Design a protein around this ligand. Structure first.
Ligand SMILES: CC(C)(COP(=O)(O)OP(=O)(O)OC[C@H]1O[C@@H](n2cnc3c(N)ncnc32)[C@H](O)[C@@H]1OP(=O)(O)O)[C@@H](O)C(=O)NCCC(=O)NCCSC(=O)CCC(=O)O
Ligand SMILES: CC(C)(COP(=O)(O)OP(=O)(O)OC[C@H]1O[C@@H](n2cnc3c(N)ncnc32)[C@H](O)[C@@H]1OP(=O)(O)O)[C@@H](O)C(=O)NCCC(=O)NCCSC(=O)CCC(=O)O
Ligand SMILES: Cc1ncc(COP(=O)(O)O)c(C=O)c1O
Ligand SMILES: *Cc1c(COP(=O)(O)O)cnc(C)c1O
Lengths: 399, 398
């Protein structure tokens, strides 16, 4: 039994499918987002523009976020030094959980070291709290959701993406006494489309199911207080559990769930993924809390307005260059190439020729045959930045 | 169903077993560790001494760690803004990974958002890279290891804690052509005992198995450079994969594995837990890197010598007092109470009556019937401090 052989086989398999990923070493320039320094593999340094990042509103450089972080470092040190149970519970975590509960108008919130962990731990743990739980999952749910859903044995049903008629057909066929939970996303990361929240909620109420929504690509960005798409549509009260991140629009790190005190307490008491891990550094919690708080204000709205419009302008200018990109009406702008090697070929050209950094997206992040570039215009991608990008794209494609 | 009823039943169940956990809201005072402010449930504030923390060497307040963190915040901002693939790979992560690789004298290292995630992702992904892998796991392995080992379907064998005779018996009975991996800890968090690294490595070599060691409660603290117990015993070259944390003795946050470039690249390319999650904030990576680098030096050794001795003194003083204290020769000092409700009472009294904070440890962190207090003396727990605690436990006790 030669372990190295097997490793080589597994690696070679990636190259043969043209999906081996090469990371890009960068350093974002605080105060000058979206500018970053690219550390080229040949040791050189090049100024670049980040066009595919997930700090959607540039909160990673916001002076109020950084002030809160610098203060916390000075007050309590670098980390918490423990799990939530063994000394790692700080006022910074309580405040942050209250801030999140308030955002989603829920009794409680629970903070994990990432939205990934939150989804994985919570979905799996619910199978333990609700013996016989059947989980209905949107075919394009995120990996973390799929992972949580499968982790522990138990019934799952996958419904065709956004297909509520399929959802209802599946659920009506199931044992009417079984606990049921429907898990889906408000904004899907790669297509940039919206989940039909009202219709799913309607189905959940009709069949007595819990609803679980991942608003990871929505929080900070939609709704008058940045609480997400359900807030935008006035449906937050119809959602049982919210899952969110503090690492994207909020610009820091970590994730959470928000739900009733009963739900939060059960999860925190039973989920190994919550119990057995060091709690988030107080400075992270400080920064994230400041971010959420800020984005709840009229000043936050300004950032959302600017993002919406920059996205709208970019899409307009790209279609005008004779470029069909499917515009599902969100802030995410995907350009589908449809082959992983072309996708990297094109991404290499933007990077080197133009300083436009947009990572090539392939399997398993997107289905095979749907590989793409994924632009994420933020408030800091000003009108001239946009014009810069379109002229790059035009000049590129004129090859 | 009625979902609220089931939740109540699940919560009531905790109370009935006397294991419902009440968290303690604290704020450590940077520059004055182990002092912290306890935010009492009644709104009051009280000065306390942390005695159960995992920032084992007080690196959480170290000026070089904090300097690097402040610097990074100013250079690149609050977070990375992406997954490792989508813009989240920074020079700070590369440097950190190299720093860790060097620590364990391995070709490569891979950083996850926690040692938990590292264990869970790696152990499960290994089943995918080595079809038919049989994993042999110490009965007292950490939850994260257990979670990783069972995540994907596949053979597992649990050996009685530290029992190498049992390990060998199990492994000799299995198909001799199957890929095998043995997974164990160098220091077990709750007993404070040591894994028999040499004997396990010997078995591994004899039966052609990979060795996977979790040194989470050892890195920064054992070996001349703080690389752990395998470094201490000159066994680092016989270990295939190391798992470690940046959140305990290193004083920051996050975890990692260290192994060959091949091993790291395979895991990185196949593990959903690595792929689909935002990368560690550059400031966290900056701080951790500074921490490891510092603890590699003679000045780091000073902190280890101080910790070892404070631990030695505390155990001596507690035996002297007649406490029920298990001593397996590590820096962890467990006092077994053996009942989750009395463990809470003793702990509650200690806090509100004497400003001593030592969380009651119950199931599922430790087996039922073995609930306990777990003292973690650090270099900042000076001789006066120790004197303070012993006097308090004596007065208790009564
Ligand atoms: C290949 C597929 C399409 C599904 O087939 P697999 O390759 O997993 O085959 P397999 O693992 O043997 O089969 C999948 C197992 O998981 C289950 N499964 C598959 N899809 C599911 C869904 N939507 N909901 C619930 N369960 C699902 C199957 O029933 C099966 O479980 P059983 O066998 O037990 O029945 C999946 O891997 C995938 O495409 N995932 C996409 C992940 C995603 O959406 N990522 C968003 C990226 S956003 C991001 O963070 C970017 C990241 C980056 O690149 O940096
Ligand atoms: C009593 C135990 C040992 C667990 O007893 P359980 O009854 O839960 O075990 P179980 O029901 O058998 O668990 C179910 C599945 O897990 C498997 N399983 C159990 N132990 C295993 C091991 N060592 N390796 C691999 N698999 C294992 C079983 O085979 C089983 O599958 P089958 O039954 O189908 O065979 C307790 O000590 C525990 O689980 N502790 C968690 C790990 C730990 O030591 N954590 C301390 C971390 S210190 C920390 O992080 C601090 C934290 C804090 O408190 O905040
Ligand atoms: C829908 C969804 N949920 C969760 C995650 C992971 O979030 P986090 O960075 O907080 O681990 C991703 C982001 O990559 C995602 O696309
Ligand atoms: C606490 C613990 C972990 C988790 O480490 P984090 O970095 O805090 O996730 C992993 N292994 C062991 C043995 C632990 O005690």
């Amino acid at each position: 039994m030669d372990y190295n052989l097997a490793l080589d086989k597994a690696i070679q398999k990636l190259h043969d499918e043209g999906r081996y990923r090469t990371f890009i070493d960068i350093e974002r320039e605080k105060g000058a987002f979206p500018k970053a320094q690219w550390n080229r593999p040949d040791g050189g340094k090049q100024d670049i523009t980040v066009w595919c990042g997930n700090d959607y509103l540039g909160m990673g450089q916001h002076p109020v976020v950084l002030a809160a972080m610098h203060e916390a470092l000075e007050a309590v040190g670098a980390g918490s030094g423990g799990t939530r149970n063994i000394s790692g519970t700080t006022a910074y975590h309580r405040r942050l959980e209250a801030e999140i509960a308030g955002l989603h108008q829920k009794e409680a919130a629970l903070v994990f070291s990432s939205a990934y962990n939150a989804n994985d731990a919570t979905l799996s743990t619910l199978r333990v709290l609700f013996p016989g739980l059947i989980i209905y999952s949107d075919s394009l749910n995120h990996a973390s959701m799929i992972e949580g859903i499968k982790r522990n044995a138990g019934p799952k049903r996958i419904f065709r993406h956004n297909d509520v008629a399929h959802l209802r057909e599946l659920i009506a066929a199931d044992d009417p006494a079984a606990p049921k939970l429907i898990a889906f996303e408000s904004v899907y990361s790669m297509d940039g489309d919206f989940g039909p929240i009202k219709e799913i909620c309607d189905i959940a109420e009709e069949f007595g199911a819990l609803t679980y929504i991942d608003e990871v690509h929505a929080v900070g960005m939609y709704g008058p207080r940045g609480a997400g798409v359900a807030e935008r549509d006035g449906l937050m009260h119809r959602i049982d559990i919210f899952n969110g991140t503090l690492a994207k629009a909020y610009g820091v790190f970590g994730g959470y769930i928000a739900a009733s005190a009963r739900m939060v307490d059960a999860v925190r008491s039973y989920a190994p993924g919550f119990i057995f891990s060091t709690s988030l550094p107080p400075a992270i919690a400080a920064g994230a809390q400041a971010s959420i708080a800020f984005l709840k204000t009229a000043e936050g709205q300004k950032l959302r307005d600017a993002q919406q419009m920059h996205a709208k302008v970019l899409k307009m200018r790209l279609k005008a260059l004779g470029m069909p990109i499917i515009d599902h009406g969100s802030h995410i702008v995907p350009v589908v190439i449809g082959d992983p090697v072309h996708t990297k070929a094109v991404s290499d050209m933007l990077l080197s020729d133009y300083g436009v950094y947009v990572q090539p997206i392939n399997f398993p992040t997107v289905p095979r045959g749907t590989e793409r570039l994924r632009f994420t215009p933020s408030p800091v991608h000003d009108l001239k930045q946009i014009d810069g990008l379109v002229h790059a794209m035009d000049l590129l494609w004129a090859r």
